[PDB]
């Protein structure tokens, strides 16, 4: 079986810091499966970080960046889309279990 937990969070950081996560991902012909529901995912998240306090964890997959779907969007364009918002980031992720 699969347990898919969708969670939508708003990340608010200061100028002198980061969101506190490492985005990893990726070709491009992508078929979302329950195990891999997206391409880009959080490889690590800094404990007590902005992202971390927001609820986000290692393994979460990035579905949306600021209301816009990034399910099939490349790594470059996603990092690029994250920077676009500056200190505010609304992100929609999925935590896949079992």
């Amino acid at each position: 079986d699969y347990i898919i937990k969708e969670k939508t969070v708003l990340l608010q950081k200061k100028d002198s810091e980061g969101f506190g996560f490492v985005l990893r991902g990726a070709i491009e012909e992508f078929t979302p499966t329950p195990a891999f529901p997206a391409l880009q995912y959080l490889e690590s998240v800094d404990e007590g970080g902005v992202a971390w306090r927001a609820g986000l964890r290692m393994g979460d997959f990035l579905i949306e960046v600021n209301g816009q779907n990034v399910v099939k969007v490349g790594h470059r364009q996603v990092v690029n889309m994250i920077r676009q918002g500056g200190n505010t980031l609304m992100v929609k992720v999925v935590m896949v279990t079992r």
Binding site: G18, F19, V22, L23, A26, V79
Partner: peptide, 5 residues
């Protein structure tokens, strides 16, 4: 490929 955010 990775990025620190």
């Amino acid at each position: 490929d990775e990025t620190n955010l």
